[PDB]
Amino acid sequence: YSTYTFLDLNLDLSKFRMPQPSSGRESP
Amino acid sequence: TRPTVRPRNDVAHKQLSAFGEYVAEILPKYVQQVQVSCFNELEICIHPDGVIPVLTFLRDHSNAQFKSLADLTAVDIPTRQNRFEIVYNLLSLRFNSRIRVKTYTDEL
Amino acid sequence: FGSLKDEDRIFTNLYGRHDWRLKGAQSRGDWYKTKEILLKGPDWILGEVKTSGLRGRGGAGFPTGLKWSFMNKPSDGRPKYLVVNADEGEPGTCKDREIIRHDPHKLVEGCLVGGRAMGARAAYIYIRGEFYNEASNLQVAIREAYEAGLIGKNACGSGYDFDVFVVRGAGAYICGEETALIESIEGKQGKPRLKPPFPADVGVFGCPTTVANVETVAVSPTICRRGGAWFASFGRERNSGTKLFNISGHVNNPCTVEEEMSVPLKELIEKHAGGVTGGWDNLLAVIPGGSSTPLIPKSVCETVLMDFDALIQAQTGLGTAAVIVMDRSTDIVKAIARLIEFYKHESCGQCTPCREGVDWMNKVMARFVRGDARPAEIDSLWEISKQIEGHTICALGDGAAWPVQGLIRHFRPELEERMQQFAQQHQ
Amino acid sequence: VHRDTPENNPETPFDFTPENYKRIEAIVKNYPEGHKAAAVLPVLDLAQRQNGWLPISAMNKVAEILQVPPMRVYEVATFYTMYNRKPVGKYHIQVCTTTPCMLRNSDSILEAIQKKLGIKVGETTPDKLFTLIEVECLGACVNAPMVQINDNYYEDLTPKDIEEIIDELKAGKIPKPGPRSGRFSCEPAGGLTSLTEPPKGPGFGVQ
Amino acid sequence: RFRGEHALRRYPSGEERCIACKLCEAVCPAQAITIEAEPRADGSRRTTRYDIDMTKCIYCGFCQEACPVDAIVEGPNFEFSTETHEELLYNKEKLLNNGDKWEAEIAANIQADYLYR
Amino acid sequence: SNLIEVFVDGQSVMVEPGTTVLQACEKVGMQIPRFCYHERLSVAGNCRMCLVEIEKAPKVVAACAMPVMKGWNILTNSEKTKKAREGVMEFLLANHPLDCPICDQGGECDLQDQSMMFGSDRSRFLEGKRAVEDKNIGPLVKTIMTRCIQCTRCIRFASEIAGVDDLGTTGRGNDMQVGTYIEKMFMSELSGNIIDICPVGALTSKPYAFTARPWETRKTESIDVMDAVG
Amino acid sequence: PLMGWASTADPLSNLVLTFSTKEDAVAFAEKNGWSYDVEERKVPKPKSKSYGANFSWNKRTRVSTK
Numbered sequence A: 001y002s003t004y005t006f007l008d009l010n011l012d013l014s015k016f017r018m019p020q021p022s023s024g025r026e027s028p
Numbered sequence B: 001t002r003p004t005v006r007p008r009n010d011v012a013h014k015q016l017s018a019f020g021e022y023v024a025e026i027l028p029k030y031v032q033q034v035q036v037s038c039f040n041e042l043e044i045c046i047h048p049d050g051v052i053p054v055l056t057f058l059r060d061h062s063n064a065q066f067k068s069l070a071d072l073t074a075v076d077i078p079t080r081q082n083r084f085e086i087v088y089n090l091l092s093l094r095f096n097s098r099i100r101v102k103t104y105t106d107e108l
Numbered sequence C: 001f002g003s004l005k006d007e008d009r010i011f012t013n014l015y016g017r018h019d020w021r022l023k024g025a026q027s028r029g030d031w032y033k034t035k036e037i038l039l040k041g042p043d044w045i046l047g048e049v050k051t052s053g054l055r056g057r058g059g060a061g062f063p064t065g066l067k068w069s070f071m072n073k074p075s076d077g078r079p080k081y082l083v084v085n086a087d088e089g090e091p092g093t094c095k096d097r098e099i100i101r102h103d104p105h106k107l108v109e110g111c112l113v114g115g116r117a118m119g120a121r122a123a124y125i126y127i128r129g130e131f132y133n134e135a136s137n138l139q140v141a142i143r144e145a146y147e148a149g150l151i152g153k154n155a156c157g158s159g160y161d162f163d164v165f166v167v168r169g170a171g172a173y174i175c176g177e178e179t180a181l182i183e184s185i186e187g188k189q190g191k192p193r194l195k196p197p198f199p200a201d202v203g204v205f206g207c208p209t210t211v212a213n214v215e216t217v218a219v220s221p222t223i224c225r226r227g228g229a230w231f232a233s234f235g236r237e238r239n240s241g242t243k244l245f246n247i248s249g250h251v252n253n254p255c256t257v258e259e260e261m262s263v264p265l266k267e268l269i270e271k272h273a274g275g276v277t278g279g280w281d282n283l284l285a286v287i288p289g290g291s292s293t294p295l296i297p298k299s300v301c302e303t304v305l306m307d308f309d310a311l312i313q314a315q316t317g318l319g320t321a322a323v324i325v326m327d328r329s330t331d332i333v334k335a336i337a338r339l340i341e342f343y344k345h346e347s348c349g350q351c352t353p354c355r356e357g358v359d360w361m362n363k364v365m366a367r368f369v370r371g372d373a374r375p376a377e378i379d380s381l382w383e384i385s386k387q388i389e390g391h392t393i394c395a396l397g398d399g400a401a402w403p404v405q406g407l408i409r410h411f412r413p414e415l416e417e418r419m420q421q422f423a424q425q426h427q
Numbered sequence D: 001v002h003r004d005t006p007e008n009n010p011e012t013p014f015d016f017t018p019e020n021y022k023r024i025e026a027i028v029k030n031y032p033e034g035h036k037a038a039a040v041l042p043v044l045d046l047a048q049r050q051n052g053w054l055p056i057s058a059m060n061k062v063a064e065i066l067q068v069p070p071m072r073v074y075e076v077a078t079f080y081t082m083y084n085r086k087p088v089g090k091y092h093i094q095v096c097t098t099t100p101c102m103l104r105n106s107d108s109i110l111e112a113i114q115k116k117l118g119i120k121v122g123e124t125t126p127d128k129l130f131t132l133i134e135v136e137c138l139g140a141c142v143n144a145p146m147v148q149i150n151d152n153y154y155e156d157l158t159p160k161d162i163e164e165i166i167d168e169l170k171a172g173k174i175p176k177p178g179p180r181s182g183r184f185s186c187e188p189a190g191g192l193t194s195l196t197e198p199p200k201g202p203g204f205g206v207q
Numbered sequence E: 001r002f003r004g005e006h007a008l009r010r011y012p013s014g015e016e017r018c019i020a021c022k023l024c025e026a027v028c029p030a031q032a033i034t035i036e037a038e039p040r041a042d043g044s045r046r047t048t049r050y051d052i053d054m055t056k057c058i059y060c061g062f063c064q065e066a067c068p069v070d071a072i073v074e075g076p077n078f079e080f081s082t083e084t085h086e087e088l089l090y091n092k093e094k095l096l097n098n099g100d101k102w103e104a105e106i107a108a109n110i111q112a113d114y115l116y117r
Numbered sequence F: 001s002n003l004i005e006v007f008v009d010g011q012s013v014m015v016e017p018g019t020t021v022l023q024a025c026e027k028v029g030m031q032i033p034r035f036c037y038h039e040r041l042s043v044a045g046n047c048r049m050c051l052v053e054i055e056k057a058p059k060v061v062a063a064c065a066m067p068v069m070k071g072w073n074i075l076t077n078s079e080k081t082k083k084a085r086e087g088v089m090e091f092l093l094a095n096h097p098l099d100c101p102i103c104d105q106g107g108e109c110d111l112q113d114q115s116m117m118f119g120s121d122r123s124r125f126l127e128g129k130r131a132v133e134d135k136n137i138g139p140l141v142k143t144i145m146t147r148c149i150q151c152t153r154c155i156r157f158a159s160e161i162a163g164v165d166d167l168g169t170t171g172r173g174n175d176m177q178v179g180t181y182i183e184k185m186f187m188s189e190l191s192g193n194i195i196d197i198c199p200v201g202a203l204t205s206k207p208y209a210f211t212a213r214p215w216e217t218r219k220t221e222s223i224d225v226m227d228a229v230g
Numbered sequence G: 001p002l003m004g005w006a007s008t009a010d011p012l013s014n015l016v017l018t019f020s021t022k023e024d025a026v027a028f029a030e031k032n033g034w035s036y037d038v039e040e041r042k043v044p045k046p047k048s049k050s051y052g053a054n055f056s057w058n059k060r061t062r063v064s065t066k
């Protein structure tokens, strides 16, 4: 119900822990 | 199937499948291919050694009159290794039947 | 079917609609026996859904116990991922947006649990952006217990412990079918793939993934918990389970409810609580599904149960499980033309049957509600409905003729007098 | 309507917030690298968040940020619904007319809005900031023909709320982000209780 | 429905009803038609050379029944018989002039016969 | 070795395990109609014209993008396939204007050599016919984007061999378009070589534009000498 | 020089026949006996085309913007 505070969604906890990732390569 | 499609029949397709069959049976000397058209016509492919006697056989009989010579034509066909194609067309008077005689040849 | 129930009790798959909707301390149902479920092998969980036989309540069968075990390679060289849908593409479903409203912790359990059946790497979930206030609570639930170290990357008891990421669309369509969402999560426009490449667990994002619905993995913890011989308690031998229902249209309380398989519509709709239209002695044209199940009139459908095959014994099945009626005030052809009007604004545009074939029907259905010229236009309209079933790709091609063809049945003078009245009006 | 840009603002320009450049690092760390390559759905949404409506130079800004061809940006924002290209207002409001919402008498939550406000159908306000359109398929047809706003939803719309939600927003209030009346949680109403208890002996998982 | 002299029609105030779609050429049995077209500077295509070999013309009239925009019309006037072979080859600036010695003769016969065909 | 005998109309032929139904049926000397397909391009399927009724199945599949399993009976002419090739090529012949007196591909368009052989007899639409607007790109490509049956064939060529990433798809549903959103010109090497690829006469040559129809020419093969590769 | 027609000499200039194959192609040019020259039939590659490999994990064969 708050239009802002997506950094609470994105950058607060999901940036502190991803984890890890390894994410593969796929360079290509 | 519908209107505006030609209604074919099977009675004339039966007897012309019947009549021309025993023609090759009684002269297996000259006849090399017989075929029935899907619209009641007949071809009797003949090597031209028997150009005279097969006509002479259809000249007279008691089961085949065929004395109305209507059409002599000539059709060329290149890429056949024997070019030309003499084709007759004769008519039975008493029986109302059409049959053609396809005889190939070459030039010389 | 059993004893025609399908009752409503507390022994369901819901924690509480009113208990606590924010983040909490996982009091009763959430995280009860956490490490003991994943300590068993996947072969304990593979085939455990066969004890349930959950067909998947998205609108089609092909049960989740089969698509997770079978059509699943072990590994070749590339990872696997999980796609848990959450968006509602059908009109008037509302089965979602209430699960995330008060039960955020239940879904996070079956994510790692259902992924353990596949052995996939991570968990990607997709929510509509327009459900914006409710989606903010979802990351708060990630802040509640996932950020409390309960999950990931070794919690608990084993090395298998992973994450969950949240994405949002804008105005999308890939709720309605899979293999477009795995395309749209890359960044392409959303024009879905062909259906047999290599289907979705062979050819996916860069590597084969799985796609499930909400309750395809939301009931997965508790069906692994209570088990039985209880998941097949209602219904016949074909279908099994207890699904959430939703009631709209003309009723005293348009609301959700909980029932199970094989309940007839005369007792199912009129209970909980009122039938505010003519509950009888009205027309009461019922719609069994969201949109792909057409009108059924006041005949024996009300005594026909809600089995998958019972509506297959009727003219059209329904797995979306939506209830809307049209009794007295609603004109029949007026409402359904607005349903056809709807599909112009959500068709993709790939298939030449779908594109330019829907707006064939759009321009003619607006001609019938107006009331217009001579008949036999109905049959030409009926042949177009008999011309788009299996030519397109997605089920929208099936979702475009089924409301039309079911209107051709059961209603011959729906407009045979109305369009004659306009023909009487000009004459 | 038409979907092109005949060159009014080719370069507005537009820049991002220094608070918002660091948020990209959370976004890029999500995707598997190499095939990451396109995070255009939250990012161009965040550009809509900073500006409100974005120009064509705002489209060209992010193309150098994520090394895609800039033609592959025009494909996205001209497809979806919530992205905007034309200039918009402060309050974007939506009448959720759907076919079961039609059955809940959407005609009442149709006009008597334009007469109340002074605008045209499907049209922005002539003054500043009210823009009114109509949408479909956002959850509850089980509620009234409800009203969507910029960050919430107004369940249980009614002609009193037509005299309220238009009225309170002209004054600058926040008219009840949810069900303003009736059932606050959309409960079964005769089955809303369902014997609220602990769920009958958890611990069946021997199996 | 009597056939005769060739002529060309045009719209209300002059437009060259011909669109040079070449169909009258491909069905002429004597190939009396020869047309070279070109984009005129306004943009719409028109003709440059337009010929009817009135010697060769065998009057199958299929040109009248092949034009979609109904351009060429067999005008019903048997006024003929010049004195050279060099004259009867009609160029374009006979035919528009010959189509504009009269039109009310032509425009009434089409309007009394177009319902049948 | 490494083959499956598939009875194409009840007649055996051995293909590689992993080829297409189109190349199988084209090997035995047949033509299935081709709109969303090209051999020298990639493979999509969004025209849905090739539809063959496979035996022992109630459904109909398209021969563009699917492999071939253990030997089927690819029933080419059926009493249902002709209920499909009539079917799809009735829709796309409606939302289209009445050109070809003036359409410059008027002797070779593939709505004109398919529509006699396949397809229906009359029309039942009977009003409609949306009409989009056109634009200009370069001084070589005469541009009528109205006709544009959206077979996605010029579109992939920008991602194909000519590597200029310039074109796209703008729109949804009935209303989508093909041209560039901005007025950027498109010209490089091979840039005039799209007007062969466009299978209808929506694209054509600018200097050639209004000259002559293609049933009067005399096709004589030769070689050009303006480069060393011939 | 009266119309600009393509009047001409070269009395043959339009003679195309329909042959069956390469075998009797030569045999007709020699049977009447004037000089000639023969091209060769070109059949293309079969070729290897397969959808599904247009979505890669590490390859280059990958389509976009469809």
Ligand SMILES: Cc1cc2nc3c(=O)[nH]c(=O)nc-3n(C[C@H](O)[C@H](O)[C@H](O)COP(=O)(O)O)c2cc1C
Residues within 6 Å of the ligand: C055, C056, C057, C058, C059, C060, C085, C086, C087, C088, C089, C090, C175, C176, C177, C178, C211, C212, C213, C214, C216, C291, C292, C395, C396, C399
């Ligand atoms: C008209 C229609 C609308 C649908 N809408 C959705 C939807 O909004 N969300 C969803 O997850 N599935 C929807 N589906 C079903 C999808 O096919 C389904 O999500 C996918 O096949 C996965 O099946 P599952 O529900 O068993 O997980 C819809 C199907 C139809 C026919």
Ligand code: SF4
Residues within 6 Å of the ligand: C192, C347, C348, C349, C350, C351, C352, C354, C355, C392, C393, C394, C395, C396, C397
């Ligand atoms: S039916 Fe056709 S246009 Fe609609 S989503 Fe499927 S492929 Fe796309």
Ligand code: SF4
Residues within 6 Å of the ligand: E017, E018, E019, E020, E021, E022, E023, E024, E025, E035, E063, E066, E067, E068, E069, E070, E071, E072
């Ligand atoms: S009659 Fe028809 S084909 Fe002849 S010049 Fe006129 S438009 Fe062209």
Ligand code: SF4
Residues within 6 Å of the ligand: E024, E027, E028, E029, E030, E031, E032, E033, E056, E057, E058, E059, E060, E061, E062, E063, E064
């Ligand atoms: S008038 Fe006769 S000869 Fe002359 S173009 Fe017409 S059909 Fe041909």
Ligand code: SF4
Residues within 6 Å of the ligand: F147, F148, F149, F150, F151, F152, F153, F154, F155, F178, F197, F198, F199, F200, F202, F203
């Ligand atoms: S130019 Fe026209 S025919 Fe060619 S791909 Fe584009 S839309 Fe299709």
Ligand code: SF4
Residues within 6 Å of the ligand: F096, F098, F099, F100, F103, F105, F106, F109, F110, F111, F112, F147, F200, F201, F202
């Ligand atoms: S391109 Fe095709 S549809 Fe268009 S005018 Fe030519 S033949 Fe007709």
Ligand code: FES
Residues within 6 Å of the ligand: C091, C092, D096, D097, D098, D101, D135, D136, D137, D138, D139, D140, D141, D142, D146
């Ligand atoms: S569809 Fe209008 S709000 Fe649910």
Ligand code: FES
Residues within 6 Å of the ligand: F033, F034, F035, F036, F037, F044, F045, F046, F047, F048, F049, F050, F051, F062, F063, F064
């Ligand atoms: S021919 Fe291209 S999809 Fe059918």
